[PDB]
């Protein structure tokens with residue numbers, strides 16, 4: 284009855300992130316996504332399997348994990364992770380291809396904040412849930428479902444917190460994520476990695492960047508901005524830590540908030556959220572829970 288690798292047939296190459304190649308496959312007539320790792324990538328495969336198997340993790344805005352398995356083709360062994368399949372693929376792909384309505388933008392932002400709030404939330408009790416920080420949030424690591432809502436993916440670099448002992452489950456390495464989205468404190472290495480809240484705050488800075496990417500694509504009266512990655516106007520493609528630090532920490536710049544966003548309430552709310560995610564001081568940033576609340580109030584008012 285359970286989904287296993289031997290019963291899945293690969294059909295189409297989707298793409299590749301840091302570790303593992305993603306394919307679309309068919310399991311008992313249904314589409315699934317499969318991330319394939321080689322035997323020498325066992326540590327990366329196991330860590331992502333471990334994060335996704337966390338108690339109480341499942342949420343509509345977190346990629347639906349199905350299974351971790353091995354598949355021996357007779358010559359070599361592949362290490363597989365299987366999840367739900369989402370035809371639209373990444374939010375990066377979606378925003379490159381489409382413009383969104385005001386409702387569309389709010390749906391993407393609210394779902395992203397709801398997934399991050401769930402990841403971040405500690406649940407104490409018998410079947411608890413440790414707080415989890417992502418460490419690599421970006422538009423290529425968020426997927427868009429058929430209903431126009433998002434789900435967070437790419438949990439391999441995540442860190443989990445144990446409140447009872449105030450410990451993090453791994454000894455975290457510095458500057459692990461995508462350089463473009465690294466928070467100021469990660470870029471200048473002032474982050475206190477012994478305090479778990481530091482990792483949640485750095486995820487919020489990255490979410491603010493993702494909200495900027497979405498807001499650019501919100502078309503009102505046919506008016507919108509072209510798709511760009513944050514800092515497209517200040518750093519080269521594949522920027523180094525030094526290039527990012529000079530812009531974000533030294534010159535203290537952030538992505539530009541265009542004048543046209545003050546002409547619409549939804550865009551004024553989004554711009555305010557971004558500014559409050561971009562503070563250099565991690566302690567001053569909004570929480571994912573507070574953002575979820577503000578956006579839920581906005582979606583209720585808009586009638587989404």
Ligand SMILES: Fc1cnccc1Nc1nc(-c2cccc(C(F)(F)F)n2)nc2[nH]ccc12
Nearest residue numbers: 316317318364365366368369372373424436437
């Ligand atoms: F484009 C996609 C379309 N439909 C579904 C996922 C898509 N993309 C992705 N799939 C997976 C992935 C795939 C299978 C299992 C797992 C697991 F088990 F680790 F969750 N992950 N990781 C990703 N990281 C960034 C994007 C992305």
